[PDB]
Amino acid sequence: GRLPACVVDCGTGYTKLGYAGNTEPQFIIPSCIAIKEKGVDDLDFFIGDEAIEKPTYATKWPIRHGIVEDWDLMERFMEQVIFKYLRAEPEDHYFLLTEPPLNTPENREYTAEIMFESFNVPGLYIAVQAVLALAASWTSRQVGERTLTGTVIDSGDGVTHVIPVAEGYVIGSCIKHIPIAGRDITYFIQQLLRDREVGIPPEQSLETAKAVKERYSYVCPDLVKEFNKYDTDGSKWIKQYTGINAISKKEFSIDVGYERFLGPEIFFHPEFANPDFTQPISEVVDEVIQNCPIDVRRPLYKNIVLSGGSTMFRDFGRRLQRDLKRTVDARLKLSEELSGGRLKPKPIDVQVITHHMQRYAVWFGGSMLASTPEFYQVCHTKKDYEEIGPSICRHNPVFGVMS
């Protein structure tokens, strides 16, 4: 109809909600709910930025590593997402929701039961986030390069996923998980600031490690040359961060030094912070593409799409492309050296695509998908829910190539 659909992307750290057809999400709120811990007392709760620090309320996080843990808190979260922030009458708007990778169909049936039997939505589409990131990557390339085959590096506030997608379908047996994302980076930056700097209050130490990460961090080509830059000409590179105390308000200034490049370094050296994991991210991407079938590996090497907020560093795609090229030419040189039979395999082009809408890539893909007129031919309506049952939301048909 004339009313645009509602696109809600619930993450582990941040929920991005808005209406379809828009470039940016209307609200990016934290994915937490503060509750009171008979009557109307289940409506006494807050979500988002009003749920962070309340005195009489307890803050719960219903989503851990993408999987919904508590469904009552998720239902109340969707109540205040629909009726307080979006202000949408839910019987008039179609809904596009997202799911984590390797989600069970029982979770899709629970989400469909919440959406249809409690809010009475006219339609509901549950979308895989890797296909939405591949669709959001289309607004940087030409009109002949718009395909649905590629590798998605989804790095948020949880586990970083390396997902291969072949022709719009997710190869589920070749998905790999790296246990490094933005929470691990801000914990590493918090440990570095705890070891070096003084004056940081202990009740704000997670906050000031956040704003150092979002404003001053980048990646570097070489660690030793960067340390020599910071040690020799240490006035151009060392910055100052000024913050206000929550209690007894005083401006404190700290020196932001070595943690600018050592922040995002743990993607490429995971043994700096994580003891159990030691395999770098380019080896994980190389292993994922080498575990795929041989007739699809070169489209996966040609199209690597970054998505998520933890991929929003400077030159992150450049260092990922350089490390993947130097680890994919080593196998070709080893095959040319160990065999030596003048086979001469074809060189592989590795291309990592960085676009403008890289932070909310899943929401932008959902907004571009739900604005198409074919989106109402792919949804599961409430009539099909009453006729067939909740088993219609186990399968969602993959959208074709459009715009």
Binding site: R215, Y218, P221, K229, K239, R318, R322
Partner: peptide, 10 residues
């Protein structure tokens, strides 16, 4: 190859 660095902030 390397790509230098920018001593600024976002």
């Amino acid at each position: 190859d390397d790509w230098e660095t920018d001593p600024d902030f976002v």
